[PDB]
Design goal:
Chain A: It holds the Pfam family Phospholip_A2_1. The complex is a heterodimer. Chain A is mostly helical. Chain A has a single domain (about 1-119), classed as Phospholipase A2 domain (Phospholipase A2), CATH 1.20.90.10. Chain A is built from 4 helices and 2 strands; from the N terminus they run ααββαα. In chain A, strand 1 (about 70) and strand 2 form a beta hairpin. In chain A, helix 1 (about 1-10) runs parallel beside helix 3. The longest helix of chain A has 19 residues, at about 85-100. Chain B is mainly α. Chain B has a single domain, classed as Phospholipase A2 domain (Phospholipase A2, Up-down Bundle). Chain B has 4 helices and 2 strands; from the N terminus they run H-H-H-E-E-H. Chain B has a two-stranded antiparallel sheet with strand order 1-2. In chain B, strand 1 and strand 2 (about 75-80) form a beta hairpin. The chains are: A mainly alpha, B mainly alpha. The interface of A and B includes residues 17 and 114 of A. Bound molecules: zinc ion (ZN). Zinc ion binds near residues 23 and 111 of chain A.
């Protein structure tokens, strides 16, 4: 779920509050549309799509679904004791979190005017 | 169907685009948090709760479900040919568009820092 996904972000990006990824570019945090503006915003697009693929499974809601994972030394792992849905949404978050650690953060791309930037 | 929701907003508030509601307050756009900050935003918050309810229905994907409705001269009507899911979702959007056209649009509430406003 979100608190889990949010805790993952804190694991691989300790120098930055998750709130920083809540309104970044055209895809981070919000629902998403238009073209990404940087590698980070692109990570969020992939996360969006990942979640939409996790909806193809009956009664599978990424946002509310609880999974089993571990954050150690900065290294996320989704546990094997996870059903189909949890296993997929976890993997989505894991890959997203890892992508956030490598992508550079641009302040100019935080809380931008969507109407003029996304389309 | 996120797209049909855009048409509704236009059917009731032709002087604006959904973009004006894409990043407004704490709840409009997508993810909500904190105090509505505004009647208009309060509308968006209700819209979410509505979707959360509609999502209890089996395999009901509010964002992608295409429903049947009509916009005639500013009036929105969800038609009868919808099933359980489509009917519920159509009603949510329908109620939001009305709530939108009834609430004043505060420009100072577009694009705010969710971090220092929606905590
Ligand atoms: Zn914003």
């Amino acid at each position: 779920n979100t608190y889990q996904f949010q805790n993952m972000i804190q694991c691989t990006v300790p120098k930055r509050s998750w709130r920083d990824f809540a309104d970044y570019g055209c895809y981070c945090g919000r629902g998403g549309s238009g073209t990404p503006i940087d590698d980070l915003d692109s990570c969020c697009q992939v996360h969006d799509n990942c979640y939409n693929s996790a909806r193809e499974q009956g009664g599978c809601r990424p946002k509310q679904k609880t999974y089993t994972y571990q954050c150690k030394a900065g290294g996320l792992s989704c546990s094997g004791a996870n059903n189909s849905c949890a296993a997929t949404t976890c993997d989505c978050d894991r890959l997203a979190a890892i992508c956030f650690a490598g992508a550079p953060y641009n302040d100019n791309n935080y809380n931008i005017d969507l109407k003029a930037r996304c389309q | 169907n996120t797209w049909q929701f855009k048409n509704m907003i236009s059917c009731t508030v032709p002087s604006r685009s959904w973009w004006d509601f894409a990043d407004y307050g704490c709840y409009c756009g997508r993810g909500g948090s904190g105090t509505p900050s505004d009647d208009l935003d309060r509308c968006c918050q209700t819209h979410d709760n509505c979707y959360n309810e509609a999502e209890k229905i089996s395999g009901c994907n509010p964002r992608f479900r295409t429903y049947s409705y009509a916009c005639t001269a500013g009036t929105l009507t969800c038609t009868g040919r919808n099933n359980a899911c489509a009917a519920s979702v159509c009603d949510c959007d329908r109620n939001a568009a009305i709530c939108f056209a009834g609430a004043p649009y505060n420009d100072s509430n577009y694009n705010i820092d969710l971090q220092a406003r929606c905590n």
